[PDB]
Amino acid sequence: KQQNFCVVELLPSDPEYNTVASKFNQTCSHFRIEKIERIQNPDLWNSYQAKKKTMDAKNGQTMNEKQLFHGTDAGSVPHVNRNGFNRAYGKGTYFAVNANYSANDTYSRPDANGRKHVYYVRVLTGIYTHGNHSLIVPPSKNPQNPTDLYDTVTDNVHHPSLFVAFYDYQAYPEYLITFRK
Ligand SMILES: NC(=O)c1cccc(N)c1
């Protein structure tokens, strides 16, 4: 209901820290990471976890969760910590498999400080397929009962570089990376 939240800065020389970053620096090493913050919103975590449990029931052996990158403007950050992604491949939120997709300044706009922002996000990819621009939601998995859909969409199922989610509680903004270049 009241998705209040706190922002904890990760200490350089931490496990959790090095892990994130690692994956970030994996394509964005030419970048200077000013700060990294974990975002703690119990209401988002709950609504997300619930979502996962019911997917964990639905998709058999599937690995529903992925940790993907997302870049926005500084102005969006506050909204994201509170609200976390509220309402060519469709109209949803785009997450990148690799940090560098997100680093484009069309996405992670730079502020006056030239400081940039990318969330390292828990996304319930679940079962996915190729998406197209005419998508407000994911396509049905079969034509017979068009009711049961996919969980998300990608550019390429056998070697995706991005996922597009369409629902209000499918991602949790666990970390915020602030970097400079
Ligand atoms: N904004 C993003 O992180 C992103 C991810 C994948 C694709 C696009 N176009 C954007």
Swiss-Prot record:
Protein name: Protein mono-ADP-ribosyltransferase PARP14
Described purpose of this protein according to its UniProt entry: ADP-ribosyltransferase that mediates mono-ADP-ribosylation of glutamate residues on target proteins. In contrast to PARP1 and PARP2, it is not able to mediate poly-ADP-ribosylation. Has been shown to catalyze the mono-ADP-ribosylation of STAT1 at 'Glu-657' and 'Glu-705', thus decreasing STAT1 phosphorylation which negatively regulates pro-inflammatory cytokine production in macrophages in response to IFNG stimulation.
Coiled coil regions, renumbered to chain: none
Tissue: Expressed in macrophages.
Domain PARP catalytic: 1-181
Taxonomic source organism: Homo sapiens (Human)
S-S bridge residues: none
Signal peptide annotation: none
Family: Belongs to the ARTD/PARP family.
Subcellular location: Nucleus; Cytoplasm
Conditions for induction: Up-regulated by IFNG in macrophages. Down-regulated by IL4 in macrophages.
Post-translational modification: Auto-ADP-ribosylated.
